[PDB]
Amino acid sequence: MFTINAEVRKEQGKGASRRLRAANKFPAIIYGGKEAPLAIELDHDKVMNMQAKAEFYSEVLTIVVDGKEIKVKAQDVQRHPYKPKLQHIDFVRA
Amino acid sequence: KKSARIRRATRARRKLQELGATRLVVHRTPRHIYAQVIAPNGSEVLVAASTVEKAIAEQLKYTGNKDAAAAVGKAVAERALEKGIKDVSFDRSGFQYHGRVQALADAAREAGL
Amino acid sequence: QPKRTKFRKMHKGRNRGLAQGTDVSFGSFGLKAVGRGRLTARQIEAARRAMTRAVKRQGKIWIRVFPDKPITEKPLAVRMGKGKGNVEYWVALIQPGKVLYEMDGVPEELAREAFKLAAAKLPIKTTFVTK
Amino acid sequence: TIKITQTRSAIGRLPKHKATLLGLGLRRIGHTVEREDTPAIRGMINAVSFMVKVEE
Amino acid sequence: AHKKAGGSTRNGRDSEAKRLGVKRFGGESVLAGSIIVRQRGTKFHAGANVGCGRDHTLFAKADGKVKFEVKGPKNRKFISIEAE
RNA sequence: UUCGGCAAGGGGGUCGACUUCCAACCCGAUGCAAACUGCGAAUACCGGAGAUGUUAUCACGGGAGACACACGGCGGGUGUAACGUCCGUCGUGAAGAGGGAAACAACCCAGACCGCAGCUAAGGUCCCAAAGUCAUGGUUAAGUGGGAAACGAUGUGGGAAG
RNA sequence: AUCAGGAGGUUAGUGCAAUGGCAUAAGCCAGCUUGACUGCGAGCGUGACGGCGCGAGCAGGUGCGAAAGCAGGUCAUAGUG
RNA sequence: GGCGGCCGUAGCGCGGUGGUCCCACCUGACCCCAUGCCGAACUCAGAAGUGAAACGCCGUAGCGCCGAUGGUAGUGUGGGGUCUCCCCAUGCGAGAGUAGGAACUGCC
């Protein structure tokens, strides 16, 4: 169970995203049936190394957004072109 | 535009719809003959009479002949004039000439339509 | 250069051909190239034949991009002659982030040495990718 | 209504936008005008939003 | 005899069509607008073509088809000024 | 226009079976189109309401010039390419002076009555030259002060990751 | 070759280049029939300019149809001074 | 089955189940009437036999088409640098992916 810290995407845009990616942070979306979809900001360094560990997609990741966990599983990961990094990842509550 | 399924069967008539009136459909069954005064926008039946209902009056012989087709026309039209309709077009989808449909139309006029 | 394709005259043949590798298992490895560029079939052969001639240890070497864009030349005067099919044959279009050669192999890379020899034959700085 | 005040100068400003302001009645910096809230007025103020400071 | 050289459409000059009859003004029952020939159906304002929609208006006149499968070839249903 | 599997046809080799090659079809994975497209902009455009502008908008009549343009930007078509041809939109050269760019038709700022005072634009502030040889911090040593390319580089500095 | 069944929006065919349209069809087969009528206007070709053409009426009257209606030649855009 | 209302997410494939009221299939062609060669078409008559084509219900969403929650490329429009080229401001936002819908409603 990988514990990761995160926040909420308030300024949803490409410009704001590039300012986060420069500080090592990327956007992400979490959905879960009856649960309302949520957009958050994850830590680049932390996730990048964890997503490298195969078990990452099968675990019940404990994402703590601001002050509370959510528990989800990785779905797909959109990678960046010119500079190999994380662009956007999808998640599903578990 | 393309020809609708109804247009392919030419059972309908768009030329009678450009006017904005009513129709006079004539259905025929090897046992009974029906007639109706339907108005545009769906199947709005104002008045109708069946040859089987002609028995209510005093019909003895079969109800699948020509004389019975004329009797129904007078009934459907008589009820139509009671409704408030004056004019009407003949709509016999698929049939020959001098048949029972012509006797139905000739009967409709005899009433006042 | 507008992407030309069919409805044209028959030119030369593919200097390329040998797809190589066993087509029983589909994988997702690769050798990406950072930058768009046009590579002719005559070059693809040199690079492909370079690695294949090195990966004699095994196989599973495959190429995804094939030369499909025709390019003509007009060696003569000028006024007359749009363009014939000479040395400039089929040319392939590579995207800034496209994988050309991917060999189905798990961390036992004996092809990195092979991809290196080929990387020096095609015009464009390519990089080795594990994913 | 809304009070429009020219904050930016004429130098550098794009034409037409300059004609717009000349329209509202402003031909110098600091000048202020009162425009009622109506469809067009809103469109013009929108085009000159960068050059002026509006508020109702 | 036949046709050859795997080619597509065949070209010539510039189109000979206009935009006569914007419609919001009077208009005798006649071909409103011009593009392609031979078409009937619309007898009033019936501007209806696949898209954001279409329109026309005001003018009491029996009949008045369109040009053809173009600016609303479909035949809607009646329409006059408001009170002819 | 890539690969695998199945069925039918033709040719060759050893046995009326099998193996190999080629073309057409179907299924699951692999790739494309200036005259394709289930989709689909921005955007240009007709008409009508809310600014700006006023005898305008418009009608009639008199006199025209003019039908060898060019360049920058954006979008192009042709061409190996061109201070190339040939289009389109727009701003200019042509009547843009003034200022900067060392000098310079179209690059940047900007658009002029005379005289006078003041403040700025561009640009510039070591000296020639008016104005700081100004403030905080860092890098380079080559005087690099930048044609200078594809390509190469433990010359050296900064940052991140195993 | 033809005949019987099945699949089959249609890739056929529709005089002529090409696009567009069409199947209980504007395509095929068969039968019947033959409006390519006379007269006169309104409209259409940014921006004026003829012949010519076309779309849409009216008046009278030919052909076909039960009738609405359909023709001013051949589905439309070359076949002319 | 009868009789209404709303009145184009009801294209096109596929599964289960029920009615001897209604309805076509079906059966029979004496006659009205009709087929260039054929009551097949056309038109008339009776009900032996089913539900197999329909219909009533109800279960899959394949594929078409119409809506909805999530997001990056792409793209206007106006200033910045830079060898080219790229960037910023501002109005929006490919396809892939997760879900929605296979009629509705009253009366006898």
Q: How far apart are CA D23 and CA D48, in angstroms?
A: 11
Residues 6 or more apart whose CB falls under 8 angstroms from that of E6 comprise C7
Contacts of A81 in chain C (CB under 8 A): 96-97
Residues 6 or more apart whose CB falls under 8 angstroms from that of E31 comprise E64, E65, E66, E67
Measured CA distances, B17 to A32, A86, B41, D19, E38 (Å): 54, 64, 10, 56, 21
Q: How far apart are CA C12 and CA E5, in angstroms?
A: 22
Residues 6 or more apart whose CB falls under 8 angstroms from that of E78 comprise B20, E43, E44
Residues 6 or more apart whose CB falls under 8 angstroms from that of B9 comprise B93
What part of E 9-68 touches B (C-beta under 8 Å)?
43
Q: Cβ of C128: how many Cβ atoms within 10 Å? A: 13
Residue C89 main-chain phi, psi, to 5 deg: -100, -150
The answer to whether chain B touches chain E by having 3 or more C-beta pairs less than 8 angstroms apart is yes
Q: Measure CB to CB from residue B1 to each of E43, E73, E78 and give the nearest one.
A: E73
Q: Which two tokens stand for residue A5?
A: 């810290």
The domain A1-94 belongs to what CATH superfamily?
Ribosomal Protein L25; Chain P (2.40.240.10)
In contact, C50 and C123? CB cutoff 8 Å: no
Contacts of C97 in chain A (CB under 8 A): 81-82
3-state secondary structure of C126: strand
Q: Cβ of B70: how many Cβ atoms within 10 Å? A: 19
Question: Closest Cα of chain E to B1: distance in Å?
Answer: 6
Q: Which two tokens stand for residue C78?
A: 């000028």
Would you say the C-beta of C128 is within 7 Å of strand F? no
Q: How far apart are CA A12 and CA A31, in angstroms?
A: 17
Q: Which two tokens stand for residue B61?
A: 């012989």
Q: How far apart are CA E35 and CA E12, in angstroms?
A: 16
Q: Which two tokens stand for residue B95?
A: 């049939």
For residue C59, the one-letter residue type is: G
Q: How far apart are CA E14 and CA B89, in angstroms?
A: 48
CB contact under 8 A, B1 and E74: yes
